[PDB]
């Protein structure tokens, strides 16, 4: 069965810096890739980006590019993500998304996400 | 950039369909896929490439696409399964691109 | 108009226009990977099926009056360009691609596509593997090769193998990201080169064929030349290298018939 590790619920400070890691389970790590979107309450659905497995490189929304970095292991098997100047609206639930190839938009495993 | 959608409350019993409003950039060129999303439950693929559903999906449901219209169909709708959906689209719009996701109206 | 022939080269068969529009990889600006495409029964339904184009704009010819007009040496040419600079493969424009990547030379009778390719020919990584000039010592001539990439100083101090300021690396390849808006998004682009006099057809459009009736007032069809007139049997040598004359009014009054190499007249 596919299995994505969620990190657990944290405590949100303004101007912080957190990670947040997802590992991979069910299916060959580099084979497939993994990408992110987070949730608002009261609002929309609003997507992060995209990282490679097995290449490791990352692409990254314009509309929140530069706050997050992610990079991707082989061993770690999951990808981190860095938050530079936490503003309280920007702290939200996020989730993991697991997909194929970049054509193959449908994400087809879930992550559970971090909420307080 | 989200779809509008409509809102729906459930009849048992009834098939019922949920609708999505986007651009010809959003949803017209880039095909489509739906996720069926429960309170206190995780995400849920529902149909894959616009046009089919993926392995393991009930064959009960079908859904189509007209244009910036995509009816997402469900074989006789229950109440107890009834909650707000939000379509999942590529777009790729001027200097932007990215998935947008339409969150439908609360069920 | 009694009656209405139409001869085209009887041979047939499926032109490699598929395998060209459906290749899995595309060359570079760097360089136009030209490939000859003859002797097959030329078909735009294929091309049609295909992705539907951003931007389909032909000159010297119509895609209407694309299907029944013979032409004689195609030449399809394939690349990637930004979609920023899609518009720059027209002839009479300048830009990054025209004044050093490639040129469409100002007298060009072909059709030039391009369709939306970050669906497959774009990586999240970026696609380094295609690439382009910056810099190049003089404008390049048009349908010119140019394959050699050596390093190329701005400022008076050669180089020498070596690279600083004013001197700067010699070429850029571009990693389209998923992200990038449309304008910056990978196209895929074709172009077509034809040309249609003096030379034998070897490539058509699928019209059939039927006989000829000589001493026959008919509304001819020859390799796409659209004449009425009677047919009468010739005794002028032509040379092989020649196939439809010309009078001194400069319109034609003779025809070699492809199905049977022999010269026909085109008299009134
Ligand atoms: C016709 C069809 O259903 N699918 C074809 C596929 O077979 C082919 O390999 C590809 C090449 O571009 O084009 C599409
Ligand atoms: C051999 C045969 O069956 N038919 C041929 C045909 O293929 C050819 O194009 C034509 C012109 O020479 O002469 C006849």
Redesign the interface.
Known sequence: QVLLVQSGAEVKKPGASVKVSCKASGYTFTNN?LNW?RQAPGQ????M????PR?????????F?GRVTMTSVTSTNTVYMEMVSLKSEDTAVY?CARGGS??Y????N???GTLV | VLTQAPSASGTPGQRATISCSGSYSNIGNNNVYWYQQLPETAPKLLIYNNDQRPSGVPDRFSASKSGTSASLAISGLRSEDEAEYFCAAWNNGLSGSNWVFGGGTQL | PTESIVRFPNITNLCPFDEVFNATTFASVYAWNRKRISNCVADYSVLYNFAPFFAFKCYGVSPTKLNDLCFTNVYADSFVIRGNEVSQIAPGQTGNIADYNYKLPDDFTGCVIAWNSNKLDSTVGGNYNYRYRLFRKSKLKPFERDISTEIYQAGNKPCNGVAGVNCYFPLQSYGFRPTYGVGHQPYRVVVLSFELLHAPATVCGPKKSTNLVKNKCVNFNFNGLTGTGVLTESNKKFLPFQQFGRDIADTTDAVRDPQTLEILDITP
């Not at chain 1, 938009?105 to 087809?108: I, L, N, S, T």
């Open positions: 890739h979107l929309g659905r609003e997507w980006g995209i990282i490679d290449s490791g490189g990352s692409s990254l929304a314009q509309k590019q989730y970049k054509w938009e449908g994400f087809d879930w992550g559970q």
